[PDB]
Design goal:
The structure is cut from a larger assembly and holds one copy of chain A (145 residues), two copies of chain B and one copy of chain C (174 residues). Chain A has 145 residues and is an all-alpha fold. Chain A is 61% helix and 0% strand. In chain C, 67% of the residues lie in helices and 2% in strands. In chain C, helix 3 (67-79) packs antiparallel against helix 8. In chain C, 22% of the residues are buried. Classes of the chains: A mainly alpha (145), B mainly alpha (103), C mainly alpha (174). Chains in contact: A-C, B-D, C-D. Chain A binds chain C through residues 21-24, 26-27, 30, 79, 81-82, 84-85, 89, 92, 122-126, and chain C through 3-4, 6-8, 10-17, 60, 67, 70-71, 74, 77, 84, 88, 91, 95, 164-165, 168. It is classed as cell cycle. The entry lists the keywords centrosome, cytoskeleton, microtubule, microtubule nucleation, complex, template, cap, gamma-tubulin, gamma-tubulin ring complex, cell cycle, nedd1, neural precursor cell-expressed developmentally down-regulated 1, CDK5RAP2, cyclin-dependent kinase 5 regulatory subunit associated protein 2. The entry is titled "Inwards conformation' of the human gamma-TuRC from purified centrosomes obtained by rigid body docking".
Chain lengths: 145, 103, 174, 105
């Protein structure tokens, strides 16, 4: 049915055709390369140097779980093309988060202000809440000081 | 009758441009034409001839006022003897509007 | 080649449906599993897809810079949604009846055949004249007086979102 | 003289395509913007000439629909009237096409 294969790539677990007609490979690569950034985040935001970097790292995992929550929820077994279209308005946003992080990286106030200039740069678009919820918690320890 | 229903349904969707600019000239007080499509190049269709005089006399009169949905009305008229007497019920929409402007 | 066709219409070409960066979607050559005088409609149908990819290739690259341009892109994602919706509808059809023909999709997909060519050139003017700034609010409005009711109601939606940026900057300033 | 000896049902399918306005058909091969029947078409019956007769009539109808499709093409690829006129013509064709498409079912 192949749907339990493609859907199990956004989680990170390898599959029979995901290692680490005939045009489906091109269609497969468009959802495949989405997975390569999800794994490229847990490798980058796993630790619990800087205090404000930890909170931003602790705020990111507050988001990925939602991405893990949305998947494995709606589709038991849907059409193959439905997967590509459903995970487009959301998948491209995942690739945008790669431009933000590395996958060097400032720390301290230099980071709490760099993330701020990412708001006005892309304010009105659909990337306003996600960046805001990060900035809203990436400055939590700095307010305590 | 089915051949008349075709030509009529083919007519309305082709006179939609004029009915727009005519209304637009009336309420917005200016003639907004493209490529001088309208007949009044600021050689005549007798479709609207029996009332044309009441248009110009309302258009120009409106322009001197500012310095100091018509198609969406013809179509509902079809809801409530074809194209000659029937068309003679369109003008009450274009004449009462005129009467206010000149008045 | 039925399911092969729908994937080509979504942005994934294959061997039977080659891709070119200059021309666009096109039938490669003659196949023995297709009617000799049928390839015509597929080439005409492929022209509907060729527009679709150039949309995504423009959307993904975001290319010119400015918030109004970027927000015009997301505004372009809303109008293309019924195209994504209506195409997905056919999937439920062929899984139900597997003997359908190639003629039915053309009868179903006539409405989108006309909307793209009018809105596609709107993108061409931007990539050819470097329309930077708020002037994009007029280029969308200059074609908003178009005659086609669907084309009018489509760019109408983009204007309803493109103004979403102006109103915000206008509010935070006034 | 050789002939292709087409089957019977194949003709109706071809006739439907002519009604649709599609070009490049094994039958009704146009040359100069004027659809014209081929010369080697024959059925088991109809003595090779009545077929040239019956098709010749339907061909006359293809001309009416091929020319209109050429007209709509030369508008798609700001007159505001022709462009508003084809949309009425175009709207009629979709509904007309549905009846022809249904028959194919």
């Amino acid at each position: 049915e192949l749907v339990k294969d493609v859907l199990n790539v956004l989680i990170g677990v390898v599959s029979a055709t995901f290692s680490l007609p005939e045009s489906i490979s091109s269609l497969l690569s468009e959802v495949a390369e989405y997975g390569t950034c999800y794994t490229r985040l847990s490798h980058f935001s796993l630790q619990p140097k800087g205090l404000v970097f930890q909170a931003f790292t602790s705020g990111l995992r507050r988001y990925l779980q939602y991405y893990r929550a949305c998947v494995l929820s709606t589709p038991p077994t849907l059409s193959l093309l439905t997967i590509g279209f459903l995970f487009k308005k959301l998948g491209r946003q995942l690739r945008y988060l790669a431009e933000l992080c590395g996958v060097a990286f400032p720390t301290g106030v230099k980071l709490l202000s760099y993330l701020y200039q990412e708001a006005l740069h892309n304010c009105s678009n659909e990337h306003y809440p996600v960046l805001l919820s990060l900035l809203k918690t990436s400055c939590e320890p700095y307010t305590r000081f | 009758e089915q051949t008349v229903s075709l030509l009529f349904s083919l007519w309305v969707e082709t006179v939609r441009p004029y009915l727009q600019t005519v209304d637009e000239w009336i309420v917005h007080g200016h003639l907004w034409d493209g490529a001088r499509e309208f007949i009044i190049q600021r050689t005549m269709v007798s479709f609207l001839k029996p009332v044309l005089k009441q248009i110009i006399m309302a258009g120009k009169s409106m322009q001197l006022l500012k310095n100091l949905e018509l198609d969406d009305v013809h179509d509902p008229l079809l809801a409530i003897t074809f194209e000659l007497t029937l068309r003679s019920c369109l003008y009450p929409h274009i004449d009462k509007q005129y009467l206010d402007c000149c008045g | 080649m039925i399911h092969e066709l729908l994937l080509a219409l979504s942005g994934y070409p294959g061997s039977i449906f080659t891709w070119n960066k200059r021309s666009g979607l096109q039938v490669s050559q003659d196949f023995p599993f297709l009617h000799p005088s049928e390839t015509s409609v597929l080439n005409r149908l492929c022209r509907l897809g060729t527009d679709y990819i150039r949309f995504t290739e423009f959307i993904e690259q975001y290319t010119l810079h400015g918030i109004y341009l970027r927000a015009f892109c997301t505004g372009l994602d809303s109008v293309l949604q019924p195209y994504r919706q209506a195409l997905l509808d056919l999937e439920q059809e062929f899984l139900g009846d597997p003997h359908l023909s190639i003629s039915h999709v053309n009868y179903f997909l006539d409405q989108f055949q006309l909307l793209f060519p009018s809105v596609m050139v709107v993108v061409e003017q931007i990539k050819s004249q470097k329309i930077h700034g708020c002037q994009i609010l007029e280029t969308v409005y200059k074609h908003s007086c178009g005659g086609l009711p669907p084309v009018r109601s489509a760019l109408e939606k983009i204007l309803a979102v493109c103004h979403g940026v102006m109103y915000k900057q206008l509010s935070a300033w006034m | 003289d050789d002939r292709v000896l087409v089957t019977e049902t194949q003709v109706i399918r071809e006739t439907l395509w002519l009604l649709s306005g599609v070009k490049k058909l094994f039958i009704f091969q146009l040359i100069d913007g004027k659809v014209t029947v081929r010369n080697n078409i024959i059925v088991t019956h109809l003595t090779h000439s009545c077929l040239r007769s019956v098709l010749e009539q339907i061909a006359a109808y293809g001309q009416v629909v091929f020319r209109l499709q050429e007209f709509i093409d030369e508008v798609m690829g700001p007159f505001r009237t022709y462009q508003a006129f084809m949309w009425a013509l175009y709207k009629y064709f979709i509904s007309f096409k549905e009846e022809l498409a249904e028959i194919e079912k």
